[PDB]
């Protein structure tokens, strides 16, 4: 519902970069950098939801899912 | 395709047939007055309602 709080914890926003290689071919695989976007304290053990990333033009050139690798 | 959109720039029309919202907002408010006047009165009067005889020719 529209009217409704939802107050979670366990999610956070979070802004992913990644490098298009050249001659890059559909189905390839390439790393992604995770950096979160407003007021969350870690990003420890989480796991990244389908993203789309997108070029200049806002073209959508891959899409990023995966777990992320927090140091410690 | 639409060409390199930026990310953190504000959304302004660019080429044509971009879409922009006005405000209309005209209050114009103009206004002029004067005047003026003259005024000029004036009274005279001389009686000699008893003349003396020494002046009773002039």
Known sequence: ?72 | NYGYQPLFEDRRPRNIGDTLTIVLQENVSASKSSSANASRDGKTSFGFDTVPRYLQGL
Not at chain 1, 10 to 18: E, G, I, S
Not at chain 1, 31 to 60: F, W, Y
């Open chain 1, 1 to 72: 519902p529209t009217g409704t709080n939802m107050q979670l914890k366990n999610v956070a926003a979070v802004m992913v970069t990644a490098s298009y290689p050249p001659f890059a071919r559909q189905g390839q695989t390439i790393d992604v950098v995770v950096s979160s976007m407003g007021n969350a304290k870690s990003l420890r053990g989480g796991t990244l939801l389908m993203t789309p990333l997108k070029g200049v033009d806002s073209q959508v050139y891959a899409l990023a899912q995966g777990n992320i690798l927090v140091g410690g």
